[PDB]
Amino acid sequence: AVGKNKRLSKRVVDPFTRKEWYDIKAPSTFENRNVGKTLVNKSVGLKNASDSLKGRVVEVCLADLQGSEDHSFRKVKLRVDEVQGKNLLTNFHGMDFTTDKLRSMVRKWQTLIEANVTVKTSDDYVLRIFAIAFTRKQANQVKRTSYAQSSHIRQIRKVISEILTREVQNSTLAQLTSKLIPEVINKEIENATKDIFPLQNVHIRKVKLLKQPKFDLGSLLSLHG
Amino acid sequence: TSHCRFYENKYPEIDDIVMVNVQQIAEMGAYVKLLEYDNIEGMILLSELSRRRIRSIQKLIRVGKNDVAVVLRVDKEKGYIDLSKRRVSSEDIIKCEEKYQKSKTVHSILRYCAEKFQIPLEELYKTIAWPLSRKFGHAYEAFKLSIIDETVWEGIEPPSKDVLDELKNYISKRLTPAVKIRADVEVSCFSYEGIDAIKDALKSAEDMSTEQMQVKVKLVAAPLYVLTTQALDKQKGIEQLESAIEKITEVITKYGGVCNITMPPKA
Amino acid sequence: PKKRASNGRNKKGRGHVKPVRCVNCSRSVPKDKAIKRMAIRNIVEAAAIRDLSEASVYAEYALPKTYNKLHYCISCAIHARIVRVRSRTDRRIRAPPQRPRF
Amino acid sequence: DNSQVFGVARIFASFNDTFVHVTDLSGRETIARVTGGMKVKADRDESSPYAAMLAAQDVAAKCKEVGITAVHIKIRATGGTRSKTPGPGGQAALRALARSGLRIGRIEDVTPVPSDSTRKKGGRRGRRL
Amino acid sequence: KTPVTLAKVIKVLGRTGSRGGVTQVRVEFLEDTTRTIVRNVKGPVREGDILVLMESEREARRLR
RNA sequence: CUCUAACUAUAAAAAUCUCUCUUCUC
Ligand SMILES: [Mg+2]
Ligand SMILES: [Mg+2]
Ligand SMILES: [Mg+2]
Ligand SMILES: [Mg+2]
Ligand SMILES: [Zn+2]
Numbered sequence: 001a002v003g004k005n006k007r008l009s010k011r012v013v014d015p016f017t018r019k020e021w022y023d024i025k026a027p028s029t030f031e032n033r034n035v036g037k038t039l040v041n042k043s044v045g046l047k048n049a050s051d052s053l054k055g056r057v058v059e060v061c062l063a064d065l066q067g068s069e070d071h072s073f074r075k076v077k078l079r080v081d082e083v084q085g086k087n088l089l090t091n092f093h094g095m096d097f098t099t100d101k102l103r104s105m106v107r108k109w110q111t112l113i114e115a116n117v118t119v120k121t122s123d124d125y126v127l128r129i130f131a132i133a134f135t136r137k138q139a140n141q142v143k144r145t146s147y148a149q150s151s152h153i154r155q156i157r158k159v160i161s162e163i164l165t166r167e168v169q170n171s172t173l174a175q176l177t178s179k180l181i182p183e184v185i186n187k188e189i190e191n192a193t194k195d196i197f198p199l200q201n202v203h204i205r206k207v208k209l210l211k212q213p214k215f216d217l218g219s220l221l222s223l224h225g
Numbered sequence: 226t227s228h229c230r231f232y233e234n235k236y237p238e239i240d241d242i243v244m245v246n247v248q249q250i251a252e253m254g255a256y257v258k259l260l261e262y263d264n265i266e267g268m269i270l271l272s273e274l275s276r277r278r279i280r281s282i283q284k285l286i287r288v289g290k291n292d293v294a295v296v297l298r299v300d301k302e303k304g305y306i307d308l309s310k311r312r313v314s315s316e317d318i319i320k321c322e323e324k325y326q327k328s329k330t331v332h333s334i335l336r337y338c339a340e341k342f343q344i345p346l347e348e349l350y351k352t353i354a355w356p357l358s359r360k361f362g363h364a365y366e367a368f369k370l371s372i373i374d375e376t377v378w379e380g381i382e383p384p385s386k387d388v389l390d391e392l393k394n395y396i397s398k399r400l401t402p403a404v405k406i407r408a409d410v411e412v413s414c415f416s417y418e419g420i421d422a423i424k425d426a427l428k429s430a431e432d433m434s435t436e437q438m439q440v441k442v443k444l445v446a447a448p449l450y451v452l453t454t455q456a457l458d459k460q461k462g463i464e465q466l467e468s469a470i471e472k473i474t475e476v477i478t479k480y481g482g483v484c485n486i487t488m489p490p491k492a
Numbered sequence: 493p494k495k496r497a498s499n500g501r502n503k504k505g506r507g508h509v510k511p512v513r514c515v516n517c518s519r520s521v522p523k524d525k526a527i528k529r530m531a532i533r534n535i536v537e538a539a540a541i542r543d544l545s546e547a548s549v550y551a552e553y554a555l556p557k558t559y560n561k562l563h564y565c566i567s568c569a570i571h572a573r574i575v576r577v578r579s580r581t582d583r584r585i586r587a588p589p590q591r592p593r594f
Numbered sequence: 595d596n597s598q599v600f601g602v603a604r605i606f607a608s609f610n611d612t613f614v615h616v617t618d619l620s621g622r623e624t625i626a627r628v629t630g631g632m633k634v635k636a637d638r639d640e641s642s643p644y645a646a647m648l649a650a651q652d653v654a655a656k657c658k659e660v661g662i663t664a665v666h667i668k669i670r671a672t673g674g675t676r677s678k679t680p681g682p683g684g685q686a687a688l689r690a691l692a693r694s695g696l697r698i699g700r701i702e703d704v705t706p707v708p709s710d711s712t713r714k715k716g717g718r719r720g721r722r723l
Numbered sequence: 724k725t726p727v728t729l730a731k732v733i734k735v736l737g738r739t740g741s742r743g744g745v746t747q748v749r750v751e752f753l754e755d756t757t758r759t760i761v762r763n764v765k766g767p768v769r770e771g772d773i774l775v776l777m778e779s780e781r782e783a784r785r786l787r
Numbered sequence: 788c789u790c791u792a793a794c795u796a797u798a799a800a801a802a803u804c805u806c807u808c809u810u811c812u813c
Contacts, residue, residue: 001631001640002240002295003312016625016660021599024619036600039623056620061700072554080620099703100535100556273635278799297635309635515677516798517723518716531679533794535669535701539782540689542758548698549598549664557794558703560679565720571798593793647780682796690780723798787797 018042023087024058026078027223029178030065035078035090056080057093066181073101082220089224092177095207102132105201110135110146113153113199115160122172124213129168129204131160131189136200152197159193164204174223180204227336229347230263231328231354231364236304237262237296242317243308244325245269245294247286255286257294257308261328267294267306276311293321327365334368334399338392344384352383353392368396403455406462408490410473411448414482422480429472433465440465449487459492466490496583501525514565516572527569529562600699601625601657603665603691607684608672611640614649614687616657616665626656630683646683650690657696664697673706675714680705729753730774736761740786747783750774 020042024035035058043049062074079093106112115131133156137146148156167185168176179185183204190202237243237259244261247269255269275285298307313321335353339346354364357377361367371377371393383389412423427442430452434440438461443451452469456462467490477484502524503509511520535558536544544555569575602621606613612630617623630645631637633652639645657665667688671678680703692698730750738746740763748768751759761783764774 001312001634001637002297003314003637005314005316021661032595034595036619038620039618039625056622058619059621060619064700069554098556099705099707100558103559104557312635312637513714513716514720515679516721518714518720520718520720531795535703536688537685537795538793539761540685540692543689544692544698547692547696550699553699553701556701556703558680562679568798572796643784644781686780693780784796 022053022083024078024080025087025089025224026060026065027090027092027174027177028225029092029174029181029223030076031067032065033224035060035065038088050083053080053083053088058090061098062181071181073098081215082217089220091220091223092173092209094209095177095180095205097203097205102205105132105134105203107134109144110137110200111148111153113148113156113160115157115164117161117164117168118210119165119168121168121176122170123216124211125173125209126211127168127173127176128208128210129164130206130208131164131202131204133160133189133193133199133203134201136198138198146198148197155196156193156199159196160189163189163192174219180207226339226346227332228263228345229350229354230261231331231358232262233355235263236265236301237299237306239296239299241296242321243267243294243296243306244291244321245308245310246291247288249288250282250286259294259306260291261325265304265306267296267308269294269308269310273309273311291325293318327363330400331364331368334392334395337395338388341391342384342388348384349388352381352388356381368400369402372396372400372402403457404459404462404492406454406456406459406466406490406492407488408452408466409488410450410452410470411485411487412450412477412482413448413485414477414480416481419477419480419482422476422482426473426476429476430469433468435465438462438465440469442469452490454490456492463490512563514568515562516568517565519565519567521565523563525566526563527566527575529564529574531560531562533558598664598697599662601662601665602668603653603688604668604670604704605646605684605687605691606670606672607641607646607681607687609641609677609681610638612646612649612681612683612687614646614653614691616653616662618662625660626653628652628656630687641681641683643683643686646685646687647690650687651694654691654694654696658694663695664699665691666699667691667701668704669701670703671705675708675712678705678707726777726779728776728779730760730762730776732768732770732772732774733759735768735770739763745786747785748774750776 018041019039021037022040023037026033026035038053038056038058040049040053056079058078058080060076060078062071062076063069065071065076075096075098076092077094077096078090080088081091082089111134113133113135115133116128117131118126118128120126135146135148137144163185167179167188171179185204186202190199193199193202232238243259245257245267246260247255247257248266249256253268254271255274256266257269259265259267271279271282274282292310293313295309295312296306297309300306331354335349336346338353339349342349357364357367360377361370367377378389412419414422416422430440430442437457438454440452440454440462443453445451452466454462454465470486474484498504501522503522509522509524512523512526513520514526534541535556541555545553564572564574566575570577601616601618604615604617604621606615614626614628614630615624616626618625628649629640630642630649631640633648634640634642634645669680669684669688671680688701730752732748733751734749736747736749738744745763745765746768747761747763749759750762751757753773760779760781762774762776762781763783763786768774
């Protein structure tokens with residue numbers, strides 16, 4: 001479609017000659033620590049690239065970090081903070097679900113319960129965590145709906161909120177992520193609300209992040225290798 | 226005979242705006258002679274003909290006349306062109322008409338030369354056309370320069386001196402163009418004697434009428450005095466009339482009267 | 493006269509519901525007179541399942557689906573073939589059209 | 595891993611002029627942006643499957659020249675308040691991307707879906723046609 | 724290049740088009756006979772013909 | 788007398804019309 005009224009209001013090169021590849025190194029809380037490669041402009045004395053990498057947020061499937069496929073529908077965002085030269089080191093930045101699974105579990109004829117909590121971890125990191133649960137049809141329910149009363153929903157939200165506050169205030173996102181990978185918090189939340197309501201598909205989705213204290217060098221290098 | 230495209234290649238280029246003379250129409254589309262380039266036909270698709278919805282083929286095609294066009298795809302093994310007419314902007318057609326007019330003037334001049342000399346137009350283009358286009362970028366601009374500055378034909382080998390001589394004769398006879406630089410001065414004099422001052426300013430202005438640029442003070446009304454010059458270079462007349470303005474102001478200020486500027490020297 | 497004892501709305505005890513927009517023509521129509529269709533499909537059709545399977549790492553990918561509930565208007569629903577005019581003795585039936593496939 | 599250099603395909607298919615725009619894992623680095631309208635004449639068959647096919651072939655050639663051998667599909671509809679249903683071209687774009695040697699991993703749909711926000715364009719009675 | 728390929732029809736999927744003069748078939752390549760396309764034909768065909776295609780990524784879409 | 792699976796997807800333009808209406812009983 002050449003049509004262009006040239007309302008502009010050759011010195012051409014190949015930008016790929018002045019570029020190269022860095023390597024993404026995952027935290028030791030994950031198994032497959034070799035994530036991938038990132039394309040970067042060549043280093044310049046006036047404008048060093050190492051400044052340019054830091055702040056990058058790579059988005060990788062969780063199953064790509066642990067080899068299994070039980071974590072297929074999760075997703076983790078890593079933050080580039082420290083570059084060792086031809087290889088850079090990444091810290092945890094956030095967590096999320098895949099929209100496919102989320103829409104797969106958000107089905108009709110059952111009430112979804114959302115618990116939202118903003119807390120501070122063991123260190124100065126400040127997190128926001130969303131938990132989503134779905135009422136479960138009993139294994140004997142001839143009634144075809146599986147709705148939950150507002151009182152049950154409020155009780156469930158209270159329980160999930162207190163559980164998340166407990167499990168965040170008692171550990172750091174190193175330990176918190178090492179806890180998120182085997183999704184033991186989901187099982188604990190489901191067990192704590194077994195008496196209130198069945199609560200199928202108790203999941204923790206979109207673990208956000210809002211603050212970072214200064215840099216936290218020593219643990220960052222300790223988190224790798 | 227009419228052949229030998231103006232531009233660099235007989236076959237066209239990619240995305241080059243072209244310039245069509247339609248000959249006939251088939252069911253698929255219009256096969257159209259290309260006049261910007263040498264002779265080779267282009268295919269204008271029916272679905273890519275009209276800006277508006279297609280309703281009357283012959284109303285828009287106008288078999289036997291010239292129009293604007295744009296090339297989309299080219300074939301560089303045997304010769305085929307895909308063309309469009311819908312996708313022409315409002316402003317591009319103007320540059321298309323001017324390019325057509327200048328290229329057609331050059332074509333007519335050199336076809337006249339070839340018909341007089343009975344040598345194929347391609348050979349005359351070999352000796353005249355594209356070395357000139359390499360030197361100046363446009364054969365018509367170089368023709369205008371040769372009208373003014375004859376160093377244009379230096380460094381090029383013509384088939385014969387007669388070719389260049391008769392080309393110069395034709396270009397001087399047909400491509401003959403001097404811009405009328407006109408200004409208006411308001412004499413607001415109220416002093417005792419101004420007719421003598423007006424005559425002195427007249428003489429001061431008219432004495433500087435050079436051999437090629439004759440500046441004349443024409444008289445129409447009492448306040449409005451016209452200053453006329455034939456600027457051949459268009460960059461000297463304005464200074465001539467500015468000097469005339471300085472002279473008339475110098476003459477008028479000391480006598481007692483005043484003068485005002487109404488229209489400065491402009492093309 | 494009453495063409496529909498339910499008035500087509502399916503409201504019966506609310507007075508007012510919050511309207512939703514049409515996916516095609518963006519008609520501000522009440523959420524119950526907004527005939528809904530849950531399009532659940534594969535992100536890659538059966539026409540490219542073999543091609544994707546042959547040319548994909550992660551052997552036996554789950555091939556995730558795509559889910560979208562479409563909120564049509566009613567004029568589009570008649571025109572975009574979603575819903576069809578019916579016999580006045582067939583308007584009685586509210587069951588979906590008999591399980592497209594078993 | 596056998597050193598499959600990865601990118602994200604990140605197809606964007608509206609109801610006109612689908613987009614194929616491959617980037618690295620970070621996404622801050624953009625390469626081979628060539629679109630659907632990049633390669634068709636009719637100004638409206640930009641959404642046609644053939645436009646997306648040609649765009650996909652071009653990006654596949656460019657990235658294969660680059661060094662990236664496998665891509666991650668991120669299908670995006672027009673999103674927002676609009677129809678947010680995938681465009682006709684993006685499907686053929688994905689098929690052609692999977693055709694040209696490139697390996698495929700982690701197809702995702704990343705369309706922006708709102709929480710019933712920012713009242714839709716068209717007026718109360720909408721587009722009348 | 725000249726990527727002319729052949730494709731033998733294995734089944735004919737009725738006749739389509741506003742004119743009603745074009746047909747739709749399922750073609751399978753002379754090579755790799757497990758790889759098939761759906762393609763539009765403009766002319767009389769039956770089970771056994773060998774169409775010539777300048778494309779292979781194209782798939783037939785019902786003409787309206 | 789025993790069961791919950793498959794899927795898509797077009798909207799060009801088209802205004803108007805004058806007479807004159809006539810029984811059903813074995
Ligand atoms: Mg009625
Ligand atoms: Mg209804
Ligand atoms: Mg009431
Ligand atoms: Mg209508
Ligand atoms: Zn509608």
